[PDB]
């Protein structure tokens, strides 16, 4: 999981899939749209989207 | 009202709202639906004027309306045209004398026009007017028969000071 | 290590056989540590005398009424179960109740050997009517507290004998409070407040004062283990 | 975090706070997965305002998108999809929960599932077009945090994680013995922790901060930001958790934050807790606690609050700061430093000066007592008058820190200003009576009562429990997972050790190869929908390991015989006894205390005024004046509504009597009819009065 | 009858003194009338007025006036005539 | 009496602290004594602790539904930052100890220190004004204590044995003291059955006749079939109340107090009660009720209904497919076999919980709680309502022990956040009847003693039936009592029973159903024909205090608010804006 | 009969710091009102010493830092309440912890005066880097209970001193259980098996006989009456 992570039994039986995305992504995802960071850009260009705004 | 008597519908109107609430386990008694139905039958519709100057259908204290049919009159007890009327919690407080209470849910400015026209007074009898005042209220401690009361000691007991 | 100020101890007296004792102020949380100490004492550790065990002659079997009294097995039992004997005896002893003809039988009409003492002779036993006889032994001896009737399951070769729930206490029923007081202008000190009704073998102020000695003495040999240690004094009340 | 992540329903283009009853508040069946439907505020903004749910992205256009995996011809696939509301409406998607064969195909026949109106219903497992990715998909991250949350009704949930935001940070915080997996990750995301950028080694470490030293050769300094006062007055601080010489791993958490602990939150404590009536002092949801939590600062929190004052230019003068104080003792003020200010490190109470403040004056004309007064002292006129910021009154603690801005060193200060002061007071809140305390599960209660340790309920072994709760509010409320969370508290506290060496038990055969045995003090994980069953949790009721004696306190029922404190003599029948994770909320006494006997009043009602809780005033609504009128209160009734407000001339003459000793003057007339009858005469009306 | 001591201001008990006056509103301003006359008593002139006595029942040691003229209507020392 | 917070205490009291502070030298003037209470030096607080004493306060919790939301109370001063409130007036304020504040009012005139006094005391105001009925008694922890104390139950340790040959009687004891010593050894539990010589407790009526028939009085012994704990809560009562030897329900208890208020002075009720108190949270500290899922004990028969009513289920859902059904009556159909096996599970609940059992012994005795909470915590959590009302024809199978599954909670969601938004609208129209009702009876008081009218209404307070045996009716509580009989009962017995001006309680409504009487004319306030507002003897008792009503009564606003106050406790009319209208689902 | 054999007391270690003790015989009953009023006295009027205040070189308050010191003073002050020291004087006596450098700083690096001691010299208080240097001294004096931090507003102390709050109790657990004694002719009598643990500033039994002492003399007062 993450480095630190001190030994935490769990009781789940089931198998998570996928991980819990970033909490703060809708917050910081809209401003990065806002200002078209570079990183945005190749993040929605990967999407399948061409010359992105 | 109309097949039966004023006493009837007051029972009837008791009953109903007794029955009401008990359905649904809330317990009171029967004595305060009854104060609050005899508000709704203090008036009595006056049709004609035989007896009076009361315009036809014109809402009439049920008091007033005995002591003109009885006093003023000089032939007796001459009928006046005049009968019972069931009118309601609305009508019932909203047709009250005191035109300082009426302007406390009423249009204030039709209430004073209308008072100030006619030219008439409000006595201070009740709780809404008097607390405006800032006068003491007409009830519990606050009536005239409680609050002039003298207090001394008795003589046998002042002497044995 | 001084407390802060010295208790005191007051009595008022509510009647003959029952009183009221106030001992504050007490340091805080002291009064629910002395008041369920002291009312154990005062019930079970009072040594005094009394009925044992009773044998009603003319009925050994059926222990639901007997002939010529107008009162049933259990209330005679109850009956006895209320008188007031002192000894000083430490072993059993065995006394006698006869009574012949209608009328009122009570203990004043009882014969205790030497060394035995009745308190209230005018304790109503027994009611006999017209031919009744009422000859009634009791045995007496000396104990501590409560014990409940001690059968004769193993003892089966004594016949007739009935066993009583014996109080041996002087002390009947004691009852006991904790309240709040304020003294140097703080709200936190307890107040002890301890009803005790007793017999009338003993005063209430003697049963408290041998219990504040059994406690003291108990505690002693805690106090033993090592003295001149450090341990809150309360000090002199005069001086 | 919450807030951050929060959908509100309002504002410019949206709706009003008292339009749209019942009609836009109420859970539509398409929250599942987008927004969480369970917690949300219970004030005026009910349903209004949620937050949006653990697996969920906002899509560039705007509209809300959950992922969901894709299943064919009846086997999950590793192919999730993020998928809208109206994308979701066109398939058939079913729960994270329905077993499934190890390949990945359905190993039952009839699986729950949701249709296109929002309905649940059984289809077939070759009907099945998508599934959940995980049980915990629809709550939020607050919601998340609440361990055994499917054994609690709504409401009480709903309370339970409106309270978990209220949590003040304590002096020392410890994580929760039993909690989900959700711990961890809001704390980090929450960024009120320090993590390492890049791998490397802790060069050295301090309390003001953290230096690494990274594989390429590349320093890194973290600043930790110490007694740092929060929005809302509690203190935030970090303290690092790593040690020189240490490697650390990039992501890793090297420092805490306020509500963390090993990077996992901490907002609460864990307590022995004895389920139990006792005295009647847990009455009507009251909570008894032990002074031990008092004497070890258990509960304990520092709080900081701010005092600012300014200094201007008036058309009389400019006001001034300064040391020198007319008309007051030098006693006062020795606490002063050389240019007016209270000196950092000083214990201040009610009343006392913290920057003196002098404002010119103007017009003296002294009266003639006044003249022969001050004749006779011989203290002449000052100038000035005195106004310096004073403590306000309840409020008391040290200076921990003073900021000073001038336009003499050209600061930014408004039009007209000269200086500005800003002085911060810290103190040390313990717990007391009546401070709000609530569990995880919408168990709340003041603190009614503080019994010493001595008086408390304790275990055969002489341990004292440190908190009852009463047993009549448990039933009642519906929020039976706070004795789930008591027994497996009690389990993790003392190790368990399943006789699995003949053969794995019934009970036991479902869980994990790691959970078969676990040492004392351990933290166990109970994520919500998918955590420890209520089988299971009495099976390891059985299990736990001994004390130092070698006994068992806790039976197999999960209870425990319980001494009496006050007599001694043990309690007849065995009590409920477990570990509970508790917090201290942020609805204190200190806050939540008002009084008046006179002071300010408003400048056109001639009222006493309030809002504030300084010299605040209670108001006196209409019903309370009917229920006087009810009692045939008369006097009292004329004199609250007349000389305790708006009588100008009978409430001195009332406050001069009580001083004098004199008996009350009979109450005159009120404004409000004095000023009435003057504006209805202002209207051309003959109002007059006449016995 | 055979009720406990009564302490606080429920001493003396509330049904007795009921019995001494019309109604509980009458027995209400029986106790203002003379809680009043015994602060003005106390207050007085200095020069000895005597318009009004002082109490008739020996005061404690700092029992306010109110009590003192309850205590005084339960011992039957007052007397009023109603104001009707 | 009240705790109040010594700072509070301070400041409300202030100039009162400063007068006496000048009075005693502490300080020279106003000024002075001023400077020393706001900084707060020691000698304040002697002071306070006098000027205190005996000074009533007021305290308030608002909304104000009723007259008893204001009570005065003796302030005793406390350090802390909490009022300190009785338990047993909470019920009269409506408060929960969980972060509920109330507002402190202090009297400054002889007049007003006399009203709250005597007037607005607690101690005085037991009854509720509505119906009479007490409203200060025990309750929850109390009522499970006293019920505790006097239950009983077979094969305890001690039990009285009947004698046989060879064998007499065991279980007696000479006196209560005997009983409390044998029971602090061990050898006899305050719930086993026993028999007692009782001295100083009244026996019931019939044993006193039977044993007594020319009176009982006290130190004549008797001999008491019963328990210990039963014995134990009678020596609370007066020592003029017979001996019950009951359990102690919460019906029962209520019973007793309304009892004890009819016949004793208010005083004695005030006192019964402070005791009541005390021993119920005593004997509820040890009274071994408490919460584990040990406890939440699940019926076996659950499974079998559900399976059962599945399969009903199943075929109301194939004869639906074969057209035979609608949607709707489908629906309805489904929602029916739904509620019936809801039914079904709690009557199986109710009779699998041994008696015993902490949660269903918490709900029987009356403390708090009731079945269908039970029925969901073990049961089955059954139907809920979708958003739009109706309710959903799947219901939850799942009970909140073993945890609703996600799809489970999901729809319940729905009515906890519907029900949530409800609550406060709920509020809106009851304030506007209670506001209307006031106004109207605003000016309703009493004026005069007796109008001297012969006119009233005619009432029932029984009736033969079929058997001829008189049963009562079950309208009578709130109908016939606490109203003054208009002419004499002479209507049958040939003699009188009681005459004219007679207020009907619960004594002479007793007397009057074994005279064999049905009908009476009671003086009602319709009949009534004073010039202005009512008179007394029309009115009949004031509730709140049990005897005829005092001139002055403010009788309109009283009735009002009792009207009022349960307002919200009613059905109401449906608050969805969108849908149909209601007014045709009456 | 009333049996004659008066209790008796006997003593058995069980580790350094914990004693369990036997009280028998005692009458039916009585053992557990008097196993709970010694735990009472042992858990509340046993005196002690401990630490009132402290006062760092190189702070004014507690809210703050010191240079080169991982931990903040308020975590040094939390860590100062687990010291456990013994004192012979009433009066108030100062201890002096000096130490720079890098390393750890225990409990025994503190310097004690005469009639003075510490009994956990390995309890930690802070860790110092290369450019940390510790300096604070400590006041010690005996009292008993709890009492919390002493205002300087009134205790008279110019500022830098930091009062932290007193626990004097050094016991630490104290239990008891009843069991059935046989003296001659019955079986139904209470022996009472009462275990204390106390922290190392004294050993159990003097707890005990200081609890006993405190005991017998409030109890004196009902033997007053004589
Ligand atoms: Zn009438």
Request: net charge negative.
């Amino acid at each position: 999981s993450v480095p630190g992570a001190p030994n935490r039994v769990s009781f789940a039986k089931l198998r998570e899939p996928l991980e819990v995305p970033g909490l703060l992504d809708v917050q910081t995802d809209s401003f990065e749209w806002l200002v078209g960071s570079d990183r945005w850009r190749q993040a929605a260009i990967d999407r399948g989207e061409e010359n992105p705004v | 009202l109309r097949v039966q008597g004023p006493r009837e519908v007051q029972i009837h109107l008791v009953k109903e709202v007794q029955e009401v609430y008990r359905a649904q386990g809330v317990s009171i008694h029967d004595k305060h639906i009854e104060v609050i139905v005899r508000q709704m039958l203090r008036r009595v519709t006056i049709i004609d004027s035989g007896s009076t100057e009361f315009l036809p259908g014109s809402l009439t204290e049920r008091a007033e309306f005995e002591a003109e049919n009885r006093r003023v009159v000089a032939e007796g007890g001459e009928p006046a045209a005049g009968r019972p009327v069931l009118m309601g919690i609305t009508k019932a407080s909203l047709a009250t004398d005191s035109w300082l209470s009426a302007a406390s849910f009423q249009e204030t400015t039709r209430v004073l026009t209308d008072a100030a026209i006619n030219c008439r007074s409000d006595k201070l009898n009740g709780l809404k007017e008097n607390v405006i005042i800032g006068k003491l209220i007409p009830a519990g401690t606050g009536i005239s028969r409680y609050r002039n009361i003298q207090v001394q000691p008795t003589e046998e007991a002042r002497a044995a000071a | 290590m001084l407390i802060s100020q010295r208790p005191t101890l007051s009595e008022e007296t509510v009647a003959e056989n029952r009183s009221r004792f106030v001992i504050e102020p007490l340091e805080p949380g002291f009064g629910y540590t002395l008041g369920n100490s002291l009312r154990r004492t005062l019930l079970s550790s009072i040594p005094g005398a009394a009925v044992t065990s009773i044998r009603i002659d003319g009925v050994l079997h059926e222990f639901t009424t007997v002939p010529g009294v107008k009162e049933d097995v259990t209330d005679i039992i109850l009956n006895l179960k209320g008188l007031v004997v002192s000894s000083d005896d430490d072993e059993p002893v065995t006394m006698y109740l006869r009574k012949q003809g209608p009328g009122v039988v009570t203990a004043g009409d009882i014969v205790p050997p030497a060394g035995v003492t009745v308190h209230n002779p005018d304790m109503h036993i027994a009611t006999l009517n017209d031919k009744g006889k009422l000859e009634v032994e009791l045995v007496v001896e000396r104990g501590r507290g409560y014990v409940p009737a001690v059968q004769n399951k193993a003892s089966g070769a004594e016949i007739g004998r009935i066993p009583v729930d014996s109080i041996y206490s002087p002390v009947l029923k004691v009852t006991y409070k904790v309240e709040a007081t304020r003294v140097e202008q703080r709200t936190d000190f307890d107040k002890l407040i301890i009803d005790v009704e007793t017999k009338n073998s003993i005063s209430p102020r003697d049963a408290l004062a041998s219990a504040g000695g059994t406690l003291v003495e108990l505690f002693g040999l805690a106090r033993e283990l090592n003295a001149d240690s450090e341990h809150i004094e309360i000090g002199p009340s005069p001086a | 975090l919450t807030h951050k992540r929060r959908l509100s329903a309002l504002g410019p283009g949206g709706l009003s706070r008292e339009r749209a009853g019942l009609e836009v508040r109420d859970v539509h069946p398409s929250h599942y997965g987008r927004m969480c439907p369970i917690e949300t505020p219970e004030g005026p903004n009910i349903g209004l305002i949620g937050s949006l749910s653990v697996y969920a992205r906002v899509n560039p256009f705007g509209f809300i998108e959950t992922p969901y995996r894709k299943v064919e011809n009846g086997v999950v696939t590793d192919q999730i999809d993020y998928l809208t509301a109206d994308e979701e409406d066109r398939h058939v998607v079913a729960q994270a929960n329905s077993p499934t064969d190890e390949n990945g195909r359905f190993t039952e026949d009839r699986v729950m599932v949701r249709k296109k109106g929002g309905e649940v219903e059984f289809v077939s497992a070759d009907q099945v077009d998508y599934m959940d990715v995980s049980p915990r998909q629809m709550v939020s991250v607050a919601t998340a945090m609440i361990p055994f949350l499917e054994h609690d009704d709504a409401n009480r949930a709903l309370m339970g994680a409106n309270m978990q935001r209220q949590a003040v940070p304590l002096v020392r915080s410890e994580a929760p013995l039993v909690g989900t997996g959700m711990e961890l990750r809001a704390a980090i995301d929450a960024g009120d922790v320090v993590v390492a950028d890049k791998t490397g080694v802790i060069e050295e470490v301090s309390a003001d901060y953290i230096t690494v030293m990274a594989d390429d050769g590349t320093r890194q300094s973290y600043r930790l930001r110490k007694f740092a006062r929060s929005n809302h007055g509690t203190c935030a601080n970090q303290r690092p958790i790593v040690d020189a010489g240490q490697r650390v791993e990039a992501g890793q958490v090297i420092a805490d934050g306020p509500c963390t602990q090993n990077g996992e939150m901490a907002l609460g404590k864990n307590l022995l807790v004895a389920i139990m009536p006792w005295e009647g002092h847990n009455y009507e949801d009251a909570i008894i606690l032990s002074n031990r939590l008092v004497e070890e600062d258990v509960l304990t929190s520092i709080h900081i609050e701010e005092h600012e004052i300014d200094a201007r230019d008036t058309k009389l003068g400019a006001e001034e700061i300064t040391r020198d104080i007319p008309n007051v003792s030098d006693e006062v003020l020795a606490d002063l430093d050389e240019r007016g200010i209270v000196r950092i490190g000083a214990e201040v109470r009610d009343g006392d000066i913290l920057v003196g403040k002098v404002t010119p004056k103007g017009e003296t004309e002294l009266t003639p007592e006044e003249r022969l007064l001050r004749a006779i002292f011989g203290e002449k006129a000052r100038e000035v008058r005195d106004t310096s910021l004073k403590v306000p009154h309840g409020e008391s603690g040290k200076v921990i820190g003073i900021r000073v801005f001038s336009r003499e060193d050209d600061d930014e200060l408004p039009a007209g200003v000269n200086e500005l002061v800003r002085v911060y007071v810290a103190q040390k809140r313990k717990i007391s009576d009546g401070d709000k305390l609530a569990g995880r599960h919408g168990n709340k209660g003041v603190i009614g009562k503080i019994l010493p340790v001595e008086d408390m309920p304790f275990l055969p072994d002489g341990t004292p429990v440190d908190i009852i709760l009463n047993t009549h509010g448990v039933p009642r409320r519906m929020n039976i997972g706070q004795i789930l969370e008591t027994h497996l508290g009690w389990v993790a506290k003392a190790g368990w050790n399943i006789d699995v060496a003949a053969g794995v038990p019934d009970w036991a055969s479902k869980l994990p190869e790691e959970l078969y045995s676990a040492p004392a003090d351990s933290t166990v994980a109970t994520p919500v929908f998918d955590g420890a069953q209520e089988g299971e949790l009495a099976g390891l009721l059985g299990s736990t390991l001994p004390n130092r004696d070698g006994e068992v306190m806790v039976d197999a029922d999960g209870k425990s015989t319980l001494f009496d404190g006050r007599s001694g003599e043990p309690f007849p029948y065995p009590v409920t006894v477990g570990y509970m994770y508790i917090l201290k909320l942020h609805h204190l006494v200190d806050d939540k205390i008002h009084a008046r006997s006179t002071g300010p009043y408003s400048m056109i009602t001639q009222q006493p005024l309030g809002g504030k809780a300084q010299f605040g005033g209670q108001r006196f609504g209409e019903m309370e004046c009917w229920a006087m009128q009810a009692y045939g209160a008369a006097y009292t009734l004329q004199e609250l509504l007349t000389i305790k407000s708006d009588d100008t001339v009978g409430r001195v003459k009332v406050y001069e009597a009580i001083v004098k000793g004199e008996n009350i003057p009979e109450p005159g007339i009120p404004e409000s009819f004095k000023v009435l009858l003057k504006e209805l005469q202002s209207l051309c009306l003959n109002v007059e009065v006449l016995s | 009858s055979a009720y406990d001591t009564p302490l606080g201001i429920t001493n003396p008990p509330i049904d007795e003194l009921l019995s001494r006056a019309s109604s509980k509103y009458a027995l209400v301003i029986y106790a203002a009338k003379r809680a009043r006359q015994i602060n003005d008593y106390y207050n007085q002139l200095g020069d000895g007025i005597l318009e009004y006595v002082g109490p008739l029942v020996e005061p404690g040691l700092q029992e306010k006036p109110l009590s003192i003229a309850l205590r005084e209507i339960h011992g039957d020392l007052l007397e009023h005539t109603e104001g009707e | 009496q009240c705790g109040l917070p010594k700072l509070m205490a301070l400041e409300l009291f202030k100039p009162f602290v400063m007068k006496r502070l000048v009075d005693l030298n502490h300080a020279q003037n106003i000024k002075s004594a001023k400077r020393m209470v706001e900084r707060q030096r020691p000698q304040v607080w002697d002071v306070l602790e006098e000027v205190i004493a005996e000074h009533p306060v007021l305290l308030n919790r608002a909304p104000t539904l009723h007259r008893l939301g204001i009570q005065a109370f003796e302030p005793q001063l406390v350090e802390g930052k909490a009022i300190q409130l009785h338990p047993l007036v909470c019920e009269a304020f409506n408060a929960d100890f969980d972060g509920d504040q109330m507002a402190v009012h202090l009297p400054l005139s002889a007049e007003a220190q006399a009203e709250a006094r005597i007037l607005m005391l607690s101690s005085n105001n037991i009854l509720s004004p509505a119906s009479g009925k007490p409203l200060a008694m025990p309750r929850l922890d109390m009522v499970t204590g006293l019920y505790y104390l006097t239950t009983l139950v077979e094969g305890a340790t001690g039990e009285y044995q009947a004698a046989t040959k060879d064998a007499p009687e065991q279980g007696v004891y000479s006196s209560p003291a005997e009983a409390i010593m044998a029971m602090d050894r061990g050898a006899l539990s305050v719930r086993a059955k026993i028999k007692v010589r009782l001295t100083e407790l009244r026996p019931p009526t019939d044993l006193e006749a039977q044993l007594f028939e020319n009176g009982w009085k006290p130190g004549d012994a008797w001999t008491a079939e019963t328990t210990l704990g039963r014995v134990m809560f009678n020596e609370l009562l007066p020592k003029s109340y017979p001996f019950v030897n009951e359990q102690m329900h919460k019906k029962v208890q209520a019973r007793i107090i309304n009892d004890l208020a009819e016949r004793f002075p208010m005083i004695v009720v005030a006192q019964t009660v402070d005791k009541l108190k005390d021993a119920g949270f005593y004997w509820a500290t040890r009274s071994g009720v408490t919460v584990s899922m040990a406890d939440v004990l699940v019926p076996p028969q659950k499974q079998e209904i559900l399976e059962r009513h599945e399969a009903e289920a199943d075929a109301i859902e194939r004869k639906y497919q074969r057209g035979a059904l609608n949607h709707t009556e489908r629906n309805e159909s489904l929602v029916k076999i739904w509620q019936d096996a809801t039914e079904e599970v709690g009557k199986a609940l109710e009779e699998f919980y041994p008696a015993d059992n902490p949660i269903i012994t918490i709900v029987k005795s009356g403390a708090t709680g009731n079945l269908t909470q039970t029925r969901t915590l073990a049961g089955m959590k059954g139907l809920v309502t979708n958003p739009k009302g109706e309710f959903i024809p799947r219901p939850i199978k799942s009970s909140f022990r073993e945890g609703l599954t996600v799809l489970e909670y999901f729809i319940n969601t729905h009515g906890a956040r519907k029900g949530l938004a409800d609550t406060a609208l709920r509020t809106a129209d009851s304030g506007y009847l209670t506001r209307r009702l006031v106004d109207v009876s605003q000016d309703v008081i009493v004026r005069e003693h007796d109008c001297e009218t012969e006119r009233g209404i005619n009432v029932t307070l029984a009736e033969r039936g079929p058997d001829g045996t008189l049963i009562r009716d079950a309208h009578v509580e709130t109908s016939a009592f606490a109203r003054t009989l208009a002419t004499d009962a002479v209507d049958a017995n040939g003699n009188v029973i009681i005459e004219r001006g007679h207020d009907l309680g619960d004594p002479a409504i007793d007397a009057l159903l074994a005279a064999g009487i049905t009908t009476v004319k009671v003086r009602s306030v319709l009949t009534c024909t004073s010039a202005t507002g009512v008179c007394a003897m029309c009115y009949g008792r004031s509730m709140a205090t049990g005897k005829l009503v005092d001139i002055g009564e403010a009788v309109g606003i009283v009735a009002a608010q009792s009207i009022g106050e349960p307002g919200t406790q009613l059905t109401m009319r449906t608050f969805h804006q969108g849908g149909v209208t209601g007014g045709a689902d009456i």
